[PDB]
Structure formats: C-alpha cells, structure tokens
C-alpha cells in the first residue's frame with residue numbers, strides 16, 4: 001500500500017501508472033485494469049492528448065465503488081504554452097473537466113520553459129524554432145499557488161527543474177507554498193544522485209519517470225542503449241526470480257523515490273505491480289548506480305536555446 005508523506009500532509013502512492021504514449025483507444029481499459037490491480041496513482045498531462053479517456057476509466061471505477069476519490073492520487077501537468085498568469089487557471093480547469101474531477105491531488109509545472117500561447121503545443125516561427133514566452137518561473141509559480149488557495153489542486157509541484165531553478169522558487173519573496181514534488185527522469189543510465197540528494201534535503205519528494213528507459217519513445221534509434229535488455233541487469237533480475245522490469249521499478253523505490261512506469265498491456269500492468277514482495281541488497285543497489293552513463297530520454301532538444309532550458313547546469 002505504502003506511500004510517501006508530502007509537505008502538505010498528504011500521502012502519495014510510491015507506485016503510479018504513466019500515460020504518455022498510451023493511445024486514446026487503449027488507455028481507458030488500461031487505467032481500469034490498473035485500478036483493479038491496485039494502482040492508486042495515475043500520472044497524466046494535457047499534452048498527452050488522452051485525459052478525457054483516462055477520466056472515463058476513473059469515473060467508471062468511482063461509480064463501481066472499487067475506490068473512493070480520497071483513495072486515488074491523480075497528477076496532471078501545466079503545459080508550456082500556458083505559463084502566463086491569466087492562462088494557468090483555465091489550463092487547470094480544462095484538465096479537471098476532461099478527467100471529470102473537481103480537484104487534482106498534484107499539479108506540476110511540466111517544464112520550466114514557457115512557449116508562446118496558442119493551439120500548437122510547440123509553436124514555430126518562419127525559421128522553424130520554438131517561440132518562447134517572456135514569462136518566468138516565479139510568476140508561473142505565483143499562479144500555481146492561487147490554485148491551491150481556490151481549491152482546484154491540493155498540492156503543487158514542478159517537473160524537469162534543475163537545482164538552481166528549484167532554488168529560485170525556494171528563495172522567492174513571499175513564497176506561500178513549497179514545491180511538493182520534482183518529477184525528473186531517472187533510471188540506471190541516468191541516476192541523478194546530486195539532484196535527488198539536493199531535493200530530498202529540502203523536503204521535496206522526487207518522482208522518477210521513464211524508469212524502464214522509455215523503449216517506445218517516438219525518437220528511438222536501433223543503436224541506443226536498452227535497459228530492459230541490459231545483460232548486467234538481466235543477471236540481477238535472474239538472481240531474484242523477478243523480471244528486469246520488476247528490478248528497474250524496485251530500484252527507485254529503495255531510493256525513496258516515487259516511480260511511474262507506463263503500460264497499456266494488462267499483463268505488464270499486473271507484472272509492474274508485483275514489486276513490493278522482495279528487496280535488492282545494498283550490493284545490488286550500488287551496482288545499479290554504477291551503471292550511470294548520463295543518458296537522457298527526454299532532453300527537449302528543440303528548446304536548447306531557451307533562456308530557461310534546464311539541462312545546461314550539472315544538476
């Protein structure tokens with residue numbers, strides 16, 4: 001069942017179901033199965049273009065008495081084109097209506113980079129590059145803070161913020177609500193020891209995304225590394241009579257991180273849940289940490305010149 005305590009007093013399920021790349025015609029069934037299997041945490045976002053269909057499943061399980069709303073922990077994220085002051089509430093209310101809820105448990109700033117407002121998620125000029133907004137992280141944070149004061153979201157947090165951008169928020173004059181969660185990419189090829197040690201020292205819960213290395217990212221190459229087929233990680237799994245995926249999901253949990261693997265496949269959704277009944281030794285953990293290559297799945301390469309691009313700093 002177990003769960004981590006956030007700085008607003010709420011409890012966040014350490015395992016959750018990710019929904020990026022989950023087709024609209026498959027994800028409702030996926031979330032229904034997840035909730036049946038015992039998932040109490042769904043990770044969503046407006047930019048995934050499937051929140052209506054995630055919301056159909058959540059509504060069905062609520063009507064069915066399988067779960068009450070307080071048992072669920074629903075996360076969504078504010079996209080980059082909605083960073084302006086006047087647009088944050090609207091973006092939150094659209095997500096709430098698609099998911100058919102009246103509050104979110106956690107609302108994240110998806111990326112620290114703001115884009116020009118409009119219908120395109122990645123707006124382009126005549127040269128072909130992303131058009132930035134002149135908004136900054138602190139004004140976007142003040143808008144997120146008033147969503148807490150209005151009752152639309154219980155906790156607010158951030159995603160893909162480096163340590164200096166987190167510092168900015170923590171040092172902000174008149175700061176009312178601390179970031180509850182920083183959601184970052186984390187697996188054995190990108191272990192993130194410095195950013196995790198920093199967030200944890202400030203009471204910020206870390207959520208690991210792409211724990212299996214995201215084998216279905218649309219920009220995948222044949223010569224890219226594969227976590228799931230890594231023989232060294234295969235060997236650790238075999239020693240524990242588990243799968244490589246079960247080892248890769250257990251790895252962040254023992255680092256006190258929240259982990260959110262994605263799947264639309266009912267048998268893998270089930271498999272990914274059976275991770276509470278075994279332990280990796282401290283030797284296993286230290287071995288998996290040694291596999292760090294500093295390799296990112298999600299590098300947002302089109303925004304490399306944006307003033308708030310997060311990955312130029314070391315951590």
Ligand SMILES: NC(=O)c1ccc[n+]([C@@H]2O[C@H](COP(=O)([O-])OP(=O)(O)OC[C@H]3O[C@@H](n4cnc5c(N)ncnc54)[C@H](OP(=O)(O)O)[C@@H]3O)[C@@H](O)[C@H]2O)c1
Pocket residue numbers: 017018019020021043044110159160183208209210211212213214215216228245246260261262263264265268269271272298
């Ligand atoms: N905040 C952000 O900026 C951000 C960025 C990236 C990701 N995320 C979140 O993190 C979630 C998880 O990361 P991700 O979607 O990149 O990828 P992931 O969870 O690392 O991997 C998903 C892929 O692995 C497969 N898989 C799942 N379980 C498996 C198993 N037991 N055995 C073999 N293969 C398995 C899935 O296939 P099937 O689905 O076909 O089973 C899918 O192809 C996303 O859905 C999203 O919610 C957030």
